[PDB]
């Protein structure tokens, strides 16, 4: 039923419009404005614990918007609650990574962080250049496809609504919804790209997205080793719940 496909597509596009931490309007106003040398120096002067806390807050803020995104997708809320929780726990950060690309400047390799754009050197205190580098490499690569907001909306929803997540009780229902989303995305892409393989290129990035997010988990585990008190009493409660 084509009416169903269009209804699903329109619903996801609308949710995306209303639930990104940064609207296209706000990104347009920022126009790639970067942090000053003074601000960059301040970030570099922060202790590892202090900067990690700030990063956890920004990441949690973005994750909260992904939860709102999911709540407004009719098909997502039709899934059993157990699976809704599993999809969000396992994929919220992956959606944040896709969204981060909207707030990334591929010309100078900077990302929007705490209101302005900053390069990888702004995160020196994290002691995790590999995570920053992998995240930035993915963003630069996704930006090369010049995706429209509708395409990002649909692709991000497919990343979230993944039938392959471990422990799902009704994976087939997730699969059926994801198939409808990809069918819609395939058609939307026809309006903006000559390469009829764009969808294939996007689907091929799925493992990379997961790899970057798993690296985030790895870094957090080591940080927890050195600063367990910070994570349990200073990090945002949701961040602790999702990544313990």
């Amino acid at each position: 039923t084509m009416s169903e496909i269009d209804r699903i597509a329109q619903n996801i596009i609308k949710s995306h419009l209303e639930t990104c931490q940064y609207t296209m309007e706000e990104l347009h106003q920022l126009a790639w404005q970067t942090h000053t040398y003074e601000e960059i120096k301040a970030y570099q002067s922060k202790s590892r614990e202090a900067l990690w806390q700030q990063c956890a807050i920004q990441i949690t803020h973005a994750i909260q918007y992904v939860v709102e995104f999911a709540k407004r997708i009719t098909g997502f809320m039709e899934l059993c609650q157990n699976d809704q929780i599993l999809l969000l726990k396992s994929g919220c950060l992956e959606v944040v990574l896709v969204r981060m690309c909207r707030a990334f400047n591929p010309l100078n390799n900077t990302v929007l962080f705490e209101g302005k754009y900053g390069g990888m050197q702004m995160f020196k205190a994290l002691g995790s250049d590999d995570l920053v580098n992998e995240a930035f490499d993915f963003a630069k690569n996704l930006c090369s496809l010049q995706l429209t907001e509708e395409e990002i909306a649909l692709f991000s929803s497919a990343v979230l609504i993944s039938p392959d997540r471990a422990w799902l009780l009704e994976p087939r229902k997730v699969q059926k919804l994801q198939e409808k989303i990809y069918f819609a995305l395939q058609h939307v892409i026809q309006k903006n790209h000559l390469d009829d393989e764009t969808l294939a290129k996007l689907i091929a990035k799925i493992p990379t997205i997961t790899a970057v997010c798993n690296l985030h988990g790895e870094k957090l585990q080591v940080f927890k080793q050195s600063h367990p008190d910070i994570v349990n009493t200073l990090f945002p409660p949701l961040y602790k719940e999702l990544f313990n």
Binding site: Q64, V67, A70, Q81, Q84, I85, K89, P237, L238, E241
Partner: peptide, 10 residues
């Protein structure tokens, strides 16, 4: 999943 559960239902 106390917090995630609360947000989902908020």
């Amino acid at each position: 999943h106390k917090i995630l559960h609360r947000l989902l239902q908020e």
